[PDB]
Each structure stands twice: as C-alpha cells, then as structure tokens.
Design a protein around this ligand. Structure first.
Ligand SMILES: C/C(=C\COP(=O)(O)OP(=O)(O)O)CF
Ligand code: SF4
Length: 309
C-alpha cells in the first residue's frame, strides 16, 4: 500500500507560538499556569501540557488571584479580557496574530457603530472572541454560517455594512456565503476574499491534491478542531473515505484493507509525532515508505512575546 503525505500539513505558526507560550511560561514561573480554553484543539498537546502543570479553564472565575493566565490561540472576547484585567492576573495572550487581525477590524466597525457580519460556526471559541469585539449598541454584529443564513438576515443600515470571517473555514463554502452577502447587500465592505488564514487555505489546497491520489485520507486532528474537520470534509466531498483521528490507535484496519494508496494529513494543531505514529501503524498494516507530496512552501514564524523568551 502506498502512503502519501500532504504538504503542507500539521503545525502552523500561530499554534507553534501558542504552545511555546504555555511551555515557556511553565519554564519561567513553574506550575500551575492557567490557560483559558484548550491552548490549541489537540488532545495530545492539551494532555501533555496538563501533565506538566497547565490548568485549562473556560471562565476567569475558575482562576485564583495572583495567577498567570494565558488566553488560547483562538482569542477571547473583550468581556473576557476585561474580566481578566479587572482581576489580579498576570496575562499573556497566545491568540494567533491572524485572529487578532480580524478582532481589530470588528473593533474598528464597533467604534463606528457600523454593522458587521461574521461568517463562522456558532459556539466556536474563535467566533465567540471575534463576535465579542463588538460592543456598540448603536450598530450590530451578526453571525452567519451559510447562504440560507444570509437569505434571512435583516440589518439596520445596509449602506454601512462590513463582513469578516473565521480563520479556519472551508475556503469554498465561505466563497458561497460571501457571494450571497454581496447579492443581498451590494454595498457590503470586506477583505479582498476572506479572513481565512494562509495555513487553512494551504492545508485545504494540499488535502485536495492528496485526495486526488489517495483512496482513503486520514486527517490527524481532534474532534473539536475546526480546521482539522474541514480537511476531512474536503476529502469526503471528493468521494474519498476520510477519517479524523487523534492518534494511530484510532486507525481501524477495515479502513485500509486492500486499499492501494492511503493519504495522511494533519490539522494545524496536530504535532508531527502523531503523524509519524500514524505512518508507523499504516506500515504495520502493509504500507511502504511514506512519500511526501510536493507542496507550497510556508515560511512564516510568529515569535513568543519577549517576556517569555
Ligand atoms: C487554526 C487555529 C488554531 C489552530 O487550530 P485549532 O486549535 O485546531 O483550532 P480551530 O481550528 O478549532 O480553530 C485558530 F487558532
Ligand atoms: S490556523 Fe491560522 S489563524 Fe489559526 S492559529 Fe494557525 S496560523 Fe493562526
């Protein structure tokens, strides 16, 4: 069985930064370090960090006075940030720079009391942090997930309207929602295309090329990783059986029985060691040397804050 690896796959720069932030805080200050929400959505990364003395909470009221608190890569609402500020806490912010970019625009529209529409998935922490940057009651902040949501939205002043997106969405589904927003709201202002980040776009482009060759695609990533779910869905849409799996243990041998080419990719929050364990397990099940596909280069690194060297 031939094993092909997608490229790019795995850690993007925001993830690598957000984990280094927690690891370095642990090294500088010692346990416990509180983290608001899983620092990235990967069980292996979260369980490791917990075992080293990170405590992951959802609310700032779970954090004791005097504690060091890290916001997760996904970002947090102004309300959360203000609640942390109004408390005793030393805060470091692991929000990905490319989420912070979107937050700044939503803050700009709110100061204008102009309405804004976010494209994203309800209940995702990034969507909460981003919808949470809008506070002006004079305007409004609306969430849509699909063309049908656009088709039911009414806004106060369609002449002064802008949109933003979640960073990890399907590039193709988002394009549909945007075409619907511009048909419904012809004066709507947005980015050139969307706020999908380079790593999301590139891993989707890479999983498309992988699915073109592979009969089955394994996407290493946790059930709650938005971006990892989009890679699996993309392959499934191309007619390939695709599974989202945390680790090599999850691989059922039926999935690869008498399959001649299996592809492996990993979401932006999954460590490369998980991919290497998955490859070792497909080799036990009949696969040969893992071949990486040729892929678009990524060269971006985001450094930890200087306080955390
Ligand atoms: C892509 C992203 C973080 C890296 O991924 P995850 O932590 O899996 O988060 P998700 O895709 O669920 O937003 C946004 F911070
Ligand atoms: S997927 Fe994109 S926005 Fe999210 S942490 Fe990674 S580089 Fe940043």
């Amino acid at each position: 069985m031939q094993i092909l690896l997608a490229n790019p796959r795995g850690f993007c720069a925001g993830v690598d930064r957000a984990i280094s932030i927690v690891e370095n805080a642990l090294a500088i200050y010692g346990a416990p370090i509180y983290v608001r929400h899983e620092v990235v959505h990967n069980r292996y990364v979260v369980d490791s960090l917990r075992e080293r003395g990170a405590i992951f909470i959802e609310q700032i009221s779970e954090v004791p006075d005097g504690a060091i608190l890290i916001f997760s890569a996904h970002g947090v609402s102004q309300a959360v940030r203000n609640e942390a500020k109004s408390r005793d806490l030393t805060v470091f912010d692991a929000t990905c720079p490319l989420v912070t970019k979107v937050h700044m625009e939503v803050a700009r529209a709110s100061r204008r009391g102009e309405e804004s529409i976010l494209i994203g998935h309800a209940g995702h922490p990034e969507v909460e942090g981003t919808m949470g940057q809008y506070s002006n009651p004079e305007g409004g902040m609306y969430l849509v997930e699909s063309p049908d949501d656009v088709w039911k939205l009414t806004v106060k002043n369609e002449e002064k309207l802008s949109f933003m997106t979640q960073t990890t969405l399907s590039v193709d589904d988002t394009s549909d929602v945007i075409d619907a927003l511009r048909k419904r709201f012809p004066k709507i202002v947005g980015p050139r295309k969307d706020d999908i980040c380079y790593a999301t776009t590139n891993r989707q482009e890479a999983v498309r090329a992988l699915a073109e060759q592979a009969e089955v695609v394994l996407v290493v990533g946790s059930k709650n990783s938005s971006n990892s779910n989009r890679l699996a869905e993309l392959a499934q849409r191309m007619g390939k059986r695709a599974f989202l799996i945390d680790d090599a243990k999850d691989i059922q041998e039926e999935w690869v029985k008498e399959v001649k080419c299996v592809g492996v990719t990993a979401g932006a929050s999954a460590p490369d060691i998980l991919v290497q364990n998955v490859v070792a397990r497909l080799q036990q099940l009949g696969g040969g040397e893992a071949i990486p596909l040729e892929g678009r280069e990524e060269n971006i690194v985001f450094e930890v804050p200087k306080e955390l060297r």
